[PDB]
Amino acid sequence: SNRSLIVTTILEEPYVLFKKSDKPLYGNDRFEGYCIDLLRELSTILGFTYEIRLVEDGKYGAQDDVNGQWNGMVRELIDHKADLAVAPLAITYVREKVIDFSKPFMTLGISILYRKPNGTNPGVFSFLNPLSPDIWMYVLLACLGVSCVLFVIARFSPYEWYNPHPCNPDSDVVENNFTLLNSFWFGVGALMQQGSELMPKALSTRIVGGIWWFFTLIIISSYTANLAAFLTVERMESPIDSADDLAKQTKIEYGAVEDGATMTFFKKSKISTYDKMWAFMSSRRQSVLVKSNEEGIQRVLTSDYAFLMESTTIEFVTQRNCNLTQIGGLIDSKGYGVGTPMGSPYRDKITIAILQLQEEGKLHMMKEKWWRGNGCPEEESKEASALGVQNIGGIFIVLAAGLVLSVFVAVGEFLYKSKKNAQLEKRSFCSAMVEELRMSLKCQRR
Amino acid sequence: SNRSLIVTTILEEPYVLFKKSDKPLYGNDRFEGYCIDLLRELSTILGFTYEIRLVEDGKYGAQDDVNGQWNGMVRELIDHKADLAVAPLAITYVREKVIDFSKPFMTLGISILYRKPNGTNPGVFSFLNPLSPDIWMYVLLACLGVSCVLFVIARFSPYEWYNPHPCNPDSDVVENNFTLLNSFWFGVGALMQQGSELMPKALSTRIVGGIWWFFTLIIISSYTANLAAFLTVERMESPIDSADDLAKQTKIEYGAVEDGATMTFFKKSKISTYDKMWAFMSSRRQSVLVKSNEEGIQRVLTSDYAFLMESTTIEFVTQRNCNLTQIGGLIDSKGYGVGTPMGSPYRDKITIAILQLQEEGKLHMMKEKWWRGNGCPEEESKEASALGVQNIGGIFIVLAAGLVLSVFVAVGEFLYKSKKNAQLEKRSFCSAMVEELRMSLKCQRR
Amino acid sequence: SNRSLIVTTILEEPYVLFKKSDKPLYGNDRFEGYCIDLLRELSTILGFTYEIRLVEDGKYGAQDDVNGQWNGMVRELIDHKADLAVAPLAITYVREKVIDFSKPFMTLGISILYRKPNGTNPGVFSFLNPLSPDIWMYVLLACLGVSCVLFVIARFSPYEWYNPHPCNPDSDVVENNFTLLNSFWFGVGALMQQGSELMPKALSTRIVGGIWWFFTLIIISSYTANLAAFLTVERMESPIDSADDLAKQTKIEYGAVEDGATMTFFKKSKISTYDKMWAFMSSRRQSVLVKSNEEGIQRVLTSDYAFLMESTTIEFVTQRNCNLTQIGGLIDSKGYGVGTPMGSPYRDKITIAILQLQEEGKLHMMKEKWWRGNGCPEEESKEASALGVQNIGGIFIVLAAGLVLSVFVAVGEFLYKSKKNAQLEKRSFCSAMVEELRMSLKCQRR
Amino acid sequence: SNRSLIVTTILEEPYVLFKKSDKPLYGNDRFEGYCIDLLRELSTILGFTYEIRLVEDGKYGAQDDVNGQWNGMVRELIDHKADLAVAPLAITYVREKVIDFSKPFMTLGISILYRKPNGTNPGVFSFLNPLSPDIWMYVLLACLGVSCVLFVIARFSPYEWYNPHPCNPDSDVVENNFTLLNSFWFGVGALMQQGSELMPKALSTRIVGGIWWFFTLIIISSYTANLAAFLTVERMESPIDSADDLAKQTKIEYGAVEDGATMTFFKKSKISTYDKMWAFMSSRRQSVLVKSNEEGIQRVLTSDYAFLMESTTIEFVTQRNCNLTQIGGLIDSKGYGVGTPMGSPYRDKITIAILQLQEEGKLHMMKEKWWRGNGCPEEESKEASALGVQNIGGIFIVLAAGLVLSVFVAVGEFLYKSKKNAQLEKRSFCSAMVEELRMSLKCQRR
Ligand SMILES: CCCCCCCC/C=C/CCCCCCCC(=O)O[C@@H](COC(=O)CCCCCCCCCCCCCCC)COP(=O)([O-])OCC[N+](C)(C)C
Ligand SMILES: CCCCCCCC/C=C/CCCCCCCC(=O)O[C@@H](COC(=O)CCCCCCCCCCCCCCC)COP(=O)([O-])OCC[N+](C)(C)C
Ligand SMILES: CC(C)CCC[C@@H](C)[C@H]1CC[C@H]2[C@@H]3CC=C4C[C@@H](O)CC[C@]4(C)[C@H]3CC[C@]12C
Ligand SMILES: CC(C)CCC[C@@H](C)[C@H]1CC[C@H]2[C@@H]3CC=C4C[C@@H](O)CC[C@]4(C)[C@H]3CC[C@]12C
Ligand SMILES: CC(C)CCC[C@@H](C)[C@H]1CC[C@H]2[C@@H]3CC=C4C[C@@H](O)CC[C@]4(C)[C@H]3CC[C@]12C
Ligand SMILES: O=S1(=O)NCN(C2CC2)c2ccc(F)cc21
Ligand SMILES: O=S1(=O)NCN(C2CC2)c2ccc(F)cc21
Ligand SMILES: O=S1(=O)NCN(C2CC2)c2ccc(F)cc21
Ligand SMILES: O=S1(=O)NCN(C2CC2)c2ccc(F)cc21
Ligand SMILES: [Cl-]
Ligand SMILES: [Cl-]
Ligand code: NA
Ligand code: NA
Ligand code: NA
Ligand code: NA
Ligand code: NA
Ligand code: NA
């Protein structure tokens, strides 16, 4: 039982944080978190003691690049003012050349924050979803096709040519109701579950009308049934799915903390996907390169934005907030190791100790204690809302579109009729004045 | 004949209870309850007289860790001051080392107390729900709009003025069926999937009719599919029926008595479901860990609070408050036994006595006597799966409101025609008197 | 460390059973189960040793009623041939008077086996489910009611009386299409989404027809939406729910093992529900009173039958087989205690030991190890089957019923018309021969 | 310059591999793979020559409990026969006590190997599914039946023979519209929710029509509601995506290698999800615990088997077999490191070397080189939510089969009328030649 060990440590949530209680200045009980619970079972396997001491700089450690000076915790490991450095101190090439790390107690990497998909604006259309766009086109080609065959069959069939005007029998007038215009109007009216004023006689034409009724009944029942499936089981999806899916889109925008461990990866990279991801950030600096992790979560949360930080911080924030999600897998591969002065014998002993608690399964149990939050999967048979102008509303567009198209056809009917009346009258403006007065008579006859 | 026995009890209810009556100075006639009826029947078959005596405190028994000594009824037993403890004194491992219980006379455990679900109150006019209130107004404005467009287009188009009376050909009259009243009746009849007796013949009016048919096909398929979603997700709504169903939720919060036997179970627990239940309550142990059972029941009423207590008190308060119910089975499993000093020659004679009263069904009849009180107006018609008068309901109100409105219009048609009839021949009223006559003819003449 | 303890034990699953392996005659390792794992942690808390020995009778123990002789395990406890009796040996009044039991390690009682509900025959009807039977009656009273008002409004309105035969204008004929027969035919045809040949003019009657179309559209959309809820979420239920629900029905039938611990409860009972349950079994002996537990499970499984055994055996069988379920709660209240000779000091030591393992939570962990099976909740979004003659099929009944009713009305139309033709002809059999030839002309005219 | 270093490896792939080539007698040019590329790049920056040497056995290393000594590559290190072990030698707590690893060059864990879902093959004519094949036949027999009943009832009823040509009143002709062809056309048009041009007028035929309207209202509402159920439950079908999703199931069975590092994890586990996974596999440890990784992959193909192995081999075989996939993330967390004797002056120089190759991205480029092979034809269009040509499909076949059938009937109508036309005036063919002429008139005349 020698003298106590000085454990240098920075404050990070959920790694090391102050306890929320009264009666201040506990002393060695002022702290809790993951690294405090990790230190407790290191003091059970090995034998040593505390005076957990915070770093007087609030930094991890880096290179001054002119002085040759080290900062943060690792400056307190070079000059022997501390003994251990149980903290999120990542194992790096430039750090291992000046201190010693144990084997990792936590793996991590670079991943993506993005706002969780919501299903608030599916489109002012997308009542049109439950049938594929091939099916919406194939029912026009069926409706145009059946209407053309119904015109041909009705002219070719003898039993469709009947005697009109049964008031006066024994005449020599013979009519056919199926014109070309009336044959489209049968197929459109049957398709809309409405029925037209004319109905096929002459059994060859009733098989056409009868098989088009069975086609129509299945199509509309399949539209209603698949729409009820969409409105009951809401299955949402994200625009982006990986890093290369973010490497192509320009609408969603990138982002990382400036002068951090994540920005240095994309600067030094040579992968063609990750080289494109840095040509963005080198151009659009002061607009995507945030200066802290706490600020960059807000720009995901407010703006339309995707943020690049470490994966253990994503796994902590996305348990607290339910607006947020993780996109894709991992990009880098790093580890958190217990710092140690160079040449110290405590490196190989903690390496034994971490591997013991890993086989027992206690590092998994510590992490589940400090990273699980409320969780919010919400496990709910998706709460049905009233259907509104953000769900349907394209039918209000195509209704007003078809009522504008009908005014143009009404003028084209008015000019073509007035051209034929002017064939027995003056040039063009006589019959334009003759016909427009008749509607201004405001009477039922003539 | 020997000395009478001194028995300690404790003022919990229904166990012992001051008898609400006048005329004081009783002996042990002050007391009544379950444990008084049990001590009466144990006396008649073992042959002893007894003197009931409340303990000092209102404490069952616990070991003060500082003093190392016990308090309450287990202190009266261990000091040989009393020799029976007929009370809700739970058989515990720490209590069995200092006194001797008999075999149990009552079996219990930990269960969850929660408010009975108030219901739905579906809000007759609940059929109006699958669409937004703006959607019901926009469809009502679209039907008035299309009917005003169809009136103008069919008026100005020359191809709608056909020849009426085709039974007399080669006459010279033209008639437009699309009046103002007939244009609303096209749009109403197309909206309701029915079909009016009049059909568009020009191409300009077959665009208005054809695009209004596609509008109503989407609206009615959207109403049916979304109403299917509302009715499917509420059959998937299952109420909470387990402690594990409380584990996944954070909306309904837990609660227990601080420093009780129920709270002690969740600390020592190693079940992962019950560990999450303590990971909840250890975080919020200023709001949810209530002081007493009386305060915990009041919070189940005036909150969304779920309370954890023993099963015998849940089975007592839910017989006397039909707002409350019991969710789930039993979590723990313990029992009540009478208390004796260690080495007493009565832990075996009472075990014979309790087993004799269990074969004869007297323990069951004593529990029905004191735990059932004033049977509930419960009336479980909760299964409620079919649509009923409380569900649709209001489609009969708007029906009967429409039948009354049409009678006032039929009076207006009867008076406006008769006033025009009395404009030419009659004066005011004898035209109306003879018009009631022709309508009273029992045939299709006049 | 004295001599070894002789533990007498019977074979029961999942209590004590032979291990399934080769290399026979292990010796003290030939057994496993619940009671073997219970003995293992009794030998950890206390200190003793085995020679687990089976009973040479295969019984528990009872009274010979003439010899005064005891059988089973408890005969080996009276005569000191064994030391402990770790087995399902229930604590009974007649057993405690001759041996000693510890405190219970397992609670149990009497409950009910019954076959799990299936949803195979919902009825040849019960397409009629999604609306309540009040709603099915209120739409007849609406259809009969609207048809009566439509008859009254159309006769009272002037604008419904129109001029027929537009071939010949300027006439003095005035017709009304709304008879009493035609007014029911409008309301029936509108209700079935079909439309009749006549349509209301005269705005007061169009409000009647327009508000009946909106009534019809909501009713049929609500039928289709609630039927889709029933076919998606299959929520089954049982005929019986408790013991008193079995105390009234005569279709499902009772049953218990003859001359067992469960039959003796219903014989000795005095509760009015349980007294009725024995008047059945005393009458219908050799038909419901089975003679083993293994046979009585088959009669639940094959016949229509409800079986009364112990609840721990129900909780074991219903995890193995998925056809079976448990009905209601518990009826009796018993316990399994470790047997012990009278006056032995090992009773109070095991009582300490069982209460220690209960506070640690190990009896719950042993029971979950030996009673959980596959479980089969099946957790499946209920597999939709094709709809068949066991689901619908009542519509095939009411179709054939209405086609038989229509033949009776066709004769009643034929006799009433032939009565009116015979008013201008002979008595009754002239016009019966006149009319029947006209249909045998097989021609379109006359 | 010093002695060359002796490095032990082991024949696993992609790690070391005999180079498939002719011309034997190589040195260490026999070998290629990931660990050969790693040992090459560690040599160029640490400056040493090396001789590769397979170990003796094909064993990594394990401690025989009888002998107390090690075997395999860890035996070559502990006896100082070799001094490098560049191999998949996982860093283990028991291995770290006898040798010295470097920091990891590869991170891995336990994951689940399972066959990629083959799909649906919906079976075009899949719209025919919500009703039984007997139901589709009984509706087809009911439509033929009601149409034969309606023909007989409307013939024999006197109230159907109305007066045709009402435009000429007081004539003496009667006509029945219900012919045989018109009676099928009523029943087909009522079945398809359309409306034929003919309506029943007698009460006997309005019972046939009114009960056939109620039949088709239930049939079509049953088709739509049951098709909504089929399409809703398959959107609730989610594939297995976790180890916990395997825990609830017994249909898909587990599997691992007996006496491996993966099997050892589930024995020592205290997670309740993983304990059920071992409670499965310890029961069935003759079928599912397979001998090798090669036999376990073959059982994933030709069974419903899910296999538990390390992540690097799952990521290798799923790049070369698109029938296979990886479910879930990682369960364990371990790593591969090079092996040194205890106290060797190379565990630190290689840790510098591996961290240098990780900053320069060379470890990532070496893993892409040997784990990606011949990129998959994957083509994930699995989202497949809308109904498409593979879903309905066959309603276009039965449409086009009905359009072809009607052309053969129109030829039969053209020949039967002309043969009756050539019965009176013409002989055989010149009646048919002039009938093609009148149908070729571009107007409604002849
Ligand atoms: C059961 C019914 C039977 C009756 C059928 C009757 C015929 C019906 C014919 C339907 C034909 C339509 C085929 C288009 C399908 C592709 C969808 C699309 O890309 O939309 C996109 C383009 O946004 C748009 O412009 C909407 C698509 C065209 C609408 C304009 C014509 C209205 C169609 C009706 C004509 C009315 C008149 C016809 C009748 C008189 C917007 O969709 P989104 O979701 O917001 O964005 C994601 C797009 N994505 C999902 C593809 C990725
Ligand atoms: C969207 C629709 C709009 C159109 C509406 C049109 C009017 C429709 C009028 C419907 C009126 C029917 C009301 C009965 C409701 C009670 C159910 C019942 O008890 O059934 C039981 C009795 O078994 C039977 O006999 C069936 C009930 C009567 C059927 C015979 C008349 C046919 C009804 C149609 C008339 C056709 C002619 C009318 C049209 C020309 C069997 O049901 P179960 O499930 O097997 O057993 C459990 C019973 N339980 C669930 C109650 C516990
Ligand atoms: C493309 C737009 C702008 C103009 C199209 C003009 C079309 C729709 C017009 C011009 C000529 C018209 C036809 C002229 C004559 C007749 C005969 C009559 O008994 C029925 C209507 C019918 C058959 C018309 C139908 C509509 C018609 C074909
Ligand atoms: C109850 C069954 C057995 C017999 C009922 C007889 C009923 C349905 C019959 C007998 C008299 C019949 C009416 C006699 C005359 C006419 C006038 C005609 O222009 C339309 C049909 C109509 C209005 C008939 C409708 C049907 C009718 C009312
Ligand atoms: C195409 C082959 C296989 C079938 C036989 C030809 C069919 C289509 C023909 C042959 C006899 C024909 C019928 C003969 C007489 C009449 C009466 C007339 O007022 C209406 C048409 C009607 C009812 C015909 C309909 C068509 C008909 C049924
Ligand atoms: O800094 S390390 O000890 N060595 C380098 N790497 C590797 C990429 C394999 C990793 C990967 C994951 C870690 F947790 C640690 C390390
Ligand atoms: O205090 S006891 O006599 N022994 C412990 N238990 C057990 C559940 C085993 C129970 C369970 C219910 C009781 F009523 C008594 C007891
Ligand atoms: O045989 S016992 O020890 N004493 C009698 N009873 C009771 C009815 C309370 C019970 C109830 C449950 C048990 F587990 C044991 C017993
Ligand atoms: O053998 S290690 O160096 N130390 C233990 N673990 C840990 C998960 C903490 C891991 C995890 C991944 C590795 F690559 C190495 C190791
Ligand atoms: Cl006892
Ligand atoms: Cl190391
Ligand atoms: Na170092
Ligand atoms: Na005791
Ligand atoms: Na006894
Ligand atoms: Na080591
Ligand atoms: Na539906
Ligand atoms: Na649904």
Author numbering:
A (entry chain B), B (entry chain A), C (entry chain D), D (entry chain C): 429 to 874
Could you give the paper's own sentences about this structure?
Kainate receptors (KARs) are a subtype of ionotropic glutamate receptor (iGluR) channels, a superfamily of ligand-gated ion channels which mediate the majority of excitatory neurotransmission in the central nervous system. Kainate receptors (KARs) are tetrameric ion channels that belong to the family of ionotropic glutamate receptors (iGluRs). Four TMDs form a cation-selective ion channel, composed of the M1, M3, and M4 transmembrane helices and a re-entrant M2-loop between M1 and M3. We find that blockers reside inside the GluK2 ion channel pore, intracellular to the closed M3 helix bundle-crossing gate, with their hydrophobic heads filling the central cavity and positively charged polyamine tails spanning the selectivity filter.
The intermediate affinity blockers, PhTx-74 and KukoA, showed hook currents of intermediate amplitude. For NpTx-8 and PhTx-74, the extracellular end of the density had a bulky cap, which likely represents averaged conformations of the blockers hydrophobic head, while its intracellular region included four prongs, likely representing four different orientations of the positively charged polyamine tail. The bulky hydrophobic heads of NpTx-8 and PhTx-74 occupy the central cavity, while their polyamine tails stretch nearly the entire length of the selectivity filter. Based on the four-pronged cryo-EM densities corresponding to NpTx-8 and PhTx-74, the polyamine tails of these blockers do not align with the pore axis but instead lean towards the selectivity filter walls adopting one of four nearly identical positions in the pseudo-4-fold symmetrical ion channel. Compared to the starting pose in the cryo-EM model, PhTx-74 dramatically changed its pose during the MD simulations to maximize its interactions with the channel pore and formed several hydrogen bonds and hydrophobic interactions with the residues lining the central cavity. The resulting pose formed contacts across the channel pore. At the same time, water molecules were excluded from the central cavity. The tail of the blocker formed hydrogen bonds with the backbone carbonyls of Q621 and Q622, which were not present in the cryo-EM structural model. Overall, PhTx-74 formed fewer interactions with the channel pore than NpTx-8, explaining its somewhat weaker potency and stronger discrepancy with the cryo-EM model. This example of discrepancy between cryo-EM and MD results illustrates limitations of both methodologies and inherent differences in conditions, including temperature and averaging due to local symmetry.
